[PDB]
Amino acid sequence: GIFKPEELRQALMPTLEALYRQDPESLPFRQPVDPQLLGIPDYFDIVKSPMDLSTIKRKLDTGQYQEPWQYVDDIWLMFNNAWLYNRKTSRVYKYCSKLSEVFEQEIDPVMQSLGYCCGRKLEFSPNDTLDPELFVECTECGRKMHQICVLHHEIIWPAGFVCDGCLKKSARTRKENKFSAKRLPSTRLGTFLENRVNDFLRRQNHPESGEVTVRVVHASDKTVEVKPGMKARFVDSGEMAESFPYRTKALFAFEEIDGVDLCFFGMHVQEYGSDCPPPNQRRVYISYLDSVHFFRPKCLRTAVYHEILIGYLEYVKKLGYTTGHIWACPPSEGDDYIFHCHPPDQKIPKPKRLQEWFKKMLDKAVSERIVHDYKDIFKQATEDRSAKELPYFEGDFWPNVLEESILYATMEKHKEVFFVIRLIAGPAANSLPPIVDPDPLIPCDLMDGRDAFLTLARDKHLEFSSLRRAQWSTMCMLVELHTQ
Ligand SMILES: CNC(=O)c1cccc(CNC(=O)[C@H]2CCCN2C(=O)C2(c3ccc(Cl)cc3)CCCC2)c1
Ligand SMILES: [Zn+2]
Ligand SMILES: [Zn+2]
Numbered sequence: 155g156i157f158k159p160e161e162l163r164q165a166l167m168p169t170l171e172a173l174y175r176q177d178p179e180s181l182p183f184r185q186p187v188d189p190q191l192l193g194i195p196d197y198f199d200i201v202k203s204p205m206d207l208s209t210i211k212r213k214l215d216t217g218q219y220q221e222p223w224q225y226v227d228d229i230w231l232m233f234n235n236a237w238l239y240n241r242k243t244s245r246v247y248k249y250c251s252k253l254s255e256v257f258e259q260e261i262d263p264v265m266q267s268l269g270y271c272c273g274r275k276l277e278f279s280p281n282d283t284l285d286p287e288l289f290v291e292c293t294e295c296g297r298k299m300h301q302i303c304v305l306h307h308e309i310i311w312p313a314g315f316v317c318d319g320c321l322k323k324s325a326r327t328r329k330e331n332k333f334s335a336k337r338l339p340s341t342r343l344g345t346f347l348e349n350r351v352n353d354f355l356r357r358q359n360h361p362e363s364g365e366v367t368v369r370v371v372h373a374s375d376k377t378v379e380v381k382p383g384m385k386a387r388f389v390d391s392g393e394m395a396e397s398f399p400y401r402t403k404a405l406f407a408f409e410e411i412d413g414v415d416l417c418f419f420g421m422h423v424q425e426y427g428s429d430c431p432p433p434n435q436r437r438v439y440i441s442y443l444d445s446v447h448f449f450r451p452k453c454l455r456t457a458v459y460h461e462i463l464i465g466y467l468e469y470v471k472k473l474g475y476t477t478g479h480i481w482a483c484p485p486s487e488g489d490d491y492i493f494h495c496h497p498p499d500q501k502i503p504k505p506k507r508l509q510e511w512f513k514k515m516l517d518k519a520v521s522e523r524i525v526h527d528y529k530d531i532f533k534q535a536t537e538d539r540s541a542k543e544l545p546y547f548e549g550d551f552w553p554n555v556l557e558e559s560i561l562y563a564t565m566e567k568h569k570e571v572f573f574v575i576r577l578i579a580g581p582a583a584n585s586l587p588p589i590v591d592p593d594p595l596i597p598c599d600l601m602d603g604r605d606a607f608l609t610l611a612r613d614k615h616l617e618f619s620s621l622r623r624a625q626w627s628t629m630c631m632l633v634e635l636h637t638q
Pocket of ligand 2: 272274
């Protein structure tokens, strides 16, 4: 036992009286449902565990609740029975919804006064059913708390969870989390980007901004093989190379928010080096860009994205990559992209908004004299003067759509989607030294393309749907990156 029974009764009884005072919303909930009297004989075929305010009052008054979550569980059983049995458009359904809003406001401050994370009944995002959020138990006081509220990971703290209350009471502080973003192995690329971001943020000197970390978490050597269609026409003759080698890299940016890691940006790139045959030579392809919109302050979010993306273009330019490519079309309605379960209010941008966003960033990159020029693939193709000449990237649009044929008219209708970004133009691009990546390979199967991370996130309910859930998913993804 944690609580003297009378203490639990005095704390919780006012939240029950708050529901009882709601008239008419509590009237269907004050007494056990009597299916005969109400003419609803199928009630007990649908509702296996009836619950009502008078039963909860008796359990409270007789000391039947040993800890407050058993009370919260009975309140939500009552709400869920009503939402299950009654139609969404029915009076009882709407009364139930109103009572659940009254309960959430009342129970929050009570559960926090009793030393709990919150008083919320929490379930994951959407076989008609939702998975419940997990609890951990303080080894010192025995209070149960949301795993995600207190960010307790068994790998980081194997001896068990100790709540803030028990740590203060014993003049102790939580053992440092060494599975941090900052402690991921550093790369030259990562250091360059993060130094750019933090320099900008220090110039703004805004009180809300946290330190940013940028880490390369995957680097491996791959090959894209030419598809059979285009292999027939161009490769089979010996006119075009059969496969193009590249380095695939994955990087993430993390911000300190409320003193813990938050992963807010993700990037996959394909890097076609100087020993890669034309027409891919000295080209970089940004496969996927994703974000979780919790960057603080929100007034500097776009500018921080600019520092990372303009920074990457500056870094590859200096090494001797001439051209950048971005496939600027949104993901399809149903595809998570990099981060599983975005906030519902982080809307996939419309094509026009996405194109305009990328245009503004590249204009900044022109002002800084990092980008020479940028145009749609149509103008750049006209200006370069066959289909053999098209840069051919793993998982890109053009290798797919060129199979549908087996070009000129197709580019014009999809011109605004494909940005070509000139980093090095003219004679400067003729007599460059070899491209030598000063960072080693980083083997990491989890970050080998975007699917392994999406699979882990689905399997373990690592959502980025709220700040608190994004903070847990960041902590979990960092433990996995640290223990490969
Ligand atoms: C409810 N919503 C979802 O379920 C959902 C599903 C899938 C994805 C998303 C959110 N993800 C995105 O918008 C991704 C892909 C398209 C670009 N993008 C970004 O994060 C960046 C961006 C550019 C421009 C603008 Cl205007 C907004 C953002 C950040 C800077 C570079 C790219 C949400
Ligand atoms: Zn909680
Ligand atoms: Zn405790």
